[PDB]
Structure 1
């Protein structure tokens, strides 16, 4: 995640193993139950896309759901690209590039790039955009997996 250091700057720090394991354990115990979404939300505080793929990729089991989510993440990403067209002409030397759906999904962007966008002024909340897609896709799952 990207956290504020004592000095008063935003720097990246790694997520903790008993945080990781707590994510694992939630999924083990409460599967598709709604409490998973606030839980997720708390444990995703200050998290990167990269950390969010890590959390999704580290799941075991419920592979039908994991595929449905993936496909929702790509749909929501396809929709990001649709709604926000690429911008006019070449990229400025003085500036950094606008993200695509796949940069938001973490796929085409690097960590330093993910830190550029979030730490820069104005900052862009690429975590929160992926977060809604995850929560939206979580609703899809919850609604389906209701019996």
Structure 2
């Protein structure tokens, strides 16, 4: 990673072992749950492309999703080569034809060229694709059970939505696919009600 010294000078700090193990464990547990994308963005704060490639390589398993991310990176890197015809190229930003010297030289410059933050965008885009492919249920099938507390139903509704679109139609659909015991109370509250009101009434 690249952090600033006590002398206010951007230097290349080594990737911390706590961040390495944290990222591997996140994938081992959450396994592409929507919160893995923010956890990757935060654990890769100011990371050179070499560091991003190291974090992705330590991912144990899920190799199918990794090739899909690799293809997404390849597509985005080529698009960078078109919109921007020394200048960094898509291969330099992805860490394939760039040295750590070149990556640091691009990041610690005035004006800077954040080859690490650009690469993190490409990674987050492909990772967002992986969360949609991994979403087991569609929002059209999230329907409140007979004895399911309304909080638990909304817990599944907005998680499924956070993975699919990784909209007032969600408001109509949430009531439309709700238990009748609660659906009557939801119509009682009337249109345009705070989610706090809906869940307070169906308690």
Q: Answer whether TM exceeds 0.5 for this pair.
A: yes
Q: Distance in 2 between matches of 1:133 and 1:127?
A: 10
Cα deviation for residue 145 of structure 1 reads 1.0
Query: Relative contact order, CA 8 A, sep 6+: which one is greater?
Result: 1
The TM-score normalised by the length of structure 2 is 0.65
1:146 Cα deviation from its structure 2 partner: 0.9
Q: Could you list the runs of 4 or more consecutive aligned residues of structure 1 that deviate by over 4 angstroms after TM superposition?
A: none
RMSD over equivalenced CA pairs, Å: 0.8
| 1:123-142 mapped onto 2 (5 Å cutoff) | 123-142=112-131
Q: Deviations over 1:9-47 (max 9, x none)?
A: 111010111211011100100001000011111101111
Q: Any idea what SS the aligned residue of 2:11 has?
A: strand
Query: How many residues were matched structurally?
Result: 136
Which deviations, in whole Å up to 9, do the C-alpha atoms of 1:80-114 show, x marking residues without a partner?
Answer: 111110xxxxxxxxxxx110000000111111111
Task: Give the TM-score, by structure 1 length.
Answer: 0.89
Structure 1 residues 35-62: Cα deviation after superposition (integer angstroms, max 9, x where no partner):
0011111101111100000011111111
Unmatched 5+ residue regions in structure 2?
A: 137-203
Q: CA separation in 2, counterparts of 1:114 and 1:34?
A: 29
Larger radius of gyration: 2
